[PDB]
């Protein structure tokens, strides 16, 4: 739904979770190649809460097999690395995040990853994405 791109070895799309449809625009330049990619994530949204303590709950399934729940912290709340950790509830966020990954072997098939963004100070969900990766 919300956004799709296909790279040399991957079809990558996402949509909002069924239980949470708060809007957010996330794109990738270039389209993620699972063999290894350097680039930027483009994020553009108005958060429903402060990002001072932003972290994520990641629920990953690989070829329909469930991986254990993960928790990943982006903003620790003190001298954080990203400018958007300063953003407040209702403030426009438009940013490009450099990312890079290589050297990992991804299994063939399709993965599901729902990423749930939480404001750690309120424990309230800010948004929720439902990624769908196809590795060919």
């Amino acid at each position: 739904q919300q956004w799709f791109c296909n790279s040399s070895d991957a079809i990558i799309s996402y949509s909002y979770c069924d239980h949470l449809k708060f809007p957010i625009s996330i794109s990738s330049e270039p389209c993620i190649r699972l063999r290894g990619t350097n680039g930027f994530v483009h994020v553009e949204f108005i958060p429903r809460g402060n990002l001072k303590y932003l972290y994520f709950n990641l629920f990953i399934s690989v070829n329909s097999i469930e991986l254990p729940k993960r928790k990943e912290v982006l903003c620790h709340g003190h001298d954080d690395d990203y400018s958007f950790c300063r953003a407040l509830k209702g403030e426009t966020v438009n940013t490009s995040i450099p990312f890079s990954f290589e050297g990992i072997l991804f299994p063939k098939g399709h993965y599901r990853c729902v990423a749930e963004a939480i404001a750690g100070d309120t424990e309230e969900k800010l948004f929720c994405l439902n990624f769908t990766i196809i590795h060919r």
Binding site: V62, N63, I65, L67, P68, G103, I104, P107
Partner: protein, 589 residues
């Protein structure tokens, strides 16, 4: 009067005066710590096939002639601590086929009057802790064509001359190892080692001053050693200082393997001394080395071994021909640091209390030909890659190390050629069915001492078809999911003992066509489904003991009858709860 062990009789410290209640078929007799005082003749004639004779500390002062008649098969004779001193001619008459003579602390004074010239089968000669003052390799050594080791440790040898080693200069075809340790050597004659070839030369604890050692190593010139061993002991004379220049003489010696043991004084420069540049195997043991950096890139080391040392930092290594790296039993704790060893095929980093953050992929090692990785008995090993670049790996050992994050992805996905994996006692709680994806060649999976989510054996072996050995003992298993063993058509040993299983299910074992050994002991089973073992057509050994079997009839009918017909297969004894009666004895009406 003695103690029958097996064929093997143990008569140690029985206050015996002489060696007769022993069958002629006996092959091992330990007679030590008995006041024998004399070895009279004819004595061992009735031991036609005696192989091992131990006469240590027997207060023997006299060996009569033909005292060893009838021992046409004795291969090991041990006479340690007997004050016999003067060996008569023919003292060793009759001892054919003997290959190991231990004459430690027998007050022996020289090799020239040691009547061993006729023991053509002899291979090892230990004459340590005697009074030998001379290094002369005697003339009759030419008949002893099988002698390959002579131990002259703890004697009074002060000098090595050219004529002492005359026997080896004349016979370069001889393969000999000499142990010179604990000898107060202070002079080696000029050229004394020219044209001399030795397999192993041990020179530990010989030198008290720096300059006597430097002088003596200079006169090693011309020697060819396959293995040279240098060092000192904590409870002995030591060098006040050990400067690397002491080893200048080693540049005239051709050394294949160099081995440094404990030295009271040590500097990290000693191991990088330039005369060691062309050594092919370098080894440190008990060395107080703290850092190993800046090893010259032209060093030709092919193996490197560091045991029981004191490295404060993980070594930075660029040795481009190093094929084997061993770093074990290191004191303290260290954290793994990347290396670039493009020839590395064997890596043993076990027993170091080592932490490894980033395991594992090519960038950690810089080799494409690694086949053996032992990270066992270490600290925390944080998994973050799945062995890209390392697909040639055949042996992987994590035993007793704290694996982290291994259940949060397919950490072994690249290891399609792996044959042996050991994650036993790694504090792993498995809650991911794809934990063993990629291990399609695996033969041996040892994962004892771990646990499973909800104490349930999940479908983790769906794509480990070639498993032949699976140890799941001590995983606190309480039940097994349906179909977990459907694919293991080649499994030969299944150990599920020391769990908390309350029930079995027939279907789990219906396709173990290759199963030879099945261990179900020390669980909580009270019964088994009828016919559960009926398709195990390859079964040879089964363990069912230490289970609270319910022997009420007709419930225990199948098992009692099966255990009786297959009584040769049961190891241990499955017992009825309450009475302790063996289950194979129950006959239902």
């Amino acid at each position: 009067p003695c103690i029958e062990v097996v064929i093997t009789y143990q008569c140690m410290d029985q206050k015996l005066s002489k060696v007769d209640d022993i069958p002629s078929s006996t092959k091992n007799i330990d007679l030590s710590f008995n006041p024998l005082k004399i070895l009279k003749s004819y004595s061992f004639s009735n031991f036609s096939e005696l192989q091992w004779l131990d006469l240590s500390r027997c207060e023997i002062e006299t060996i009569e002639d033909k005292a060893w008649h009838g021992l046409h098969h004795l291969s090991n004779l041990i006479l340690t601590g007997n004050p016999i001193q003067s060996f008569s001619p023919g003292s060793f008459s009759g001892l054919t086929s003997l290959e190991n003579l231990v004459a430690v602390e027998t007050k022996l004074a020289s090799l020239e009057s040691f009547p061993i010239g006729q023991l053509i089968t002899l291979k090892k000669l230990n004459v340590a802790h005697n009074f030998i003052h001379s290094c002369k390799l005697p003339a009759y050594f030419s008949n002893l064509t099988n002698l390959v080791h002579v131990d002259l440790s703890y004697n009074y040898i002060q000098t090595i001359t050219v004529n002492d080693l005359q026997f080896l200069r004349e016979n370069p075809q001889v393969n000999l190892s000499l142990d010179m340790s604990l000898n107060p050597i202070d002079f080696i004659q000029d050229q004394a080692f020219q044209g001399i070839k030795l397999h192993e030369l041990t020179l530990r604890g010989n030198f008290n001053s720096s300059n006597i050692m430097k002088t003596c190593l200079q006169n090693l010139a011309g020697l060819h050693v396959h293995r040279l061993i240098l060092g000192e002991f904590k409870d002995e004379r030591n060098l006040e200082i050990f400067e690397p220049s002491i080893m200048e003489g080693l540049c005239d010696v051709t050394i294949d393997e160099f081995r440094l043991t404990y030295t009271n004084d040590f500097s990290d420069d000693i191991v990088k001394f330039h005369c060691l540049a062309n050594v092919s195997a370098m080894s440190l043991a008990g060395v107080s080395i703290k850092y190993l950096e800046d090893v010259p890139k032209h060093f030709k080391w092919q193996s490197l071994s560091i045991i029981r040392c004191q490295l404060k930092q993980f070594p930075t290594l660029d040795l481009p021909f190093l094929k084997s790296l061993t770093l074990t039993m290191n004191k303290g704790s260290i954290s793994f640091k990347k290396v670039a060893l493009p020839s590395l095929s064997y890596l043993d980093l076990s027993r170091n209390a080592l932490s490894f953050s980033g395991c594992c992929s090519y960038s950690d090692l810089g080799t494409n030909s690694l086949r053996h990785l032992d990270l066992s008995f270490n600290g925390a090993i944080i998994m973050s890659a799945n062995f890209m670049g390392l697909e040639e790996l055949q042996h992987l050992d994590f035993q007793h190390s704290t694996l982290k994050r291994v259940t949060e992805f397919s950490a072994f996905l690249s290891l399609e050629k792996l044959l042996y994996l050991d994650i036993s006692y790694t504090n792993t709680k498995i809650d991911f069915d794809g934990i063993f994806l990629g291990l399609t060649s695996l033969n041996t999976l040892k994962m004892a001492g771990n646990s499973f989510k909800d104490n349930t054996l999940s479908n983790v072996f769906a794509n480990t078809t070639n498993l032949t050995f699976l140890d799941l003992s001590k995983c606190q298993l309480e039940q097994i999911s349906w179909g977990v063993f459907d694919t293991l058509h080649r499994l030969q040993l299944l150990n599920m003992s020391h769990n908390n299983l309350l029930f079995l299910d027939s279907s789990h074992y219906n396709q173990l066509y290759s199963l030879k050994e099945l261990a179900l002991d020390t669980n909580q089973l009270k019964s088994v489904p009828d016919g559960i073992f009926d398709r195990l057509t390859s079964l040879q050994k089964i363990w069912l003991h230490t289970n609270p079997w319910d022997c009420s009839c007709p419930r225990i009918d199948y098992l009692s009858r099966w255990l009786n017909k297959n009584s040769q297969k049961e190891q241990g004894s499955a017992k009825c709860s309450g009475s302790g009666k063996p289950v194979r004895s129950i006959i239902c009406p």
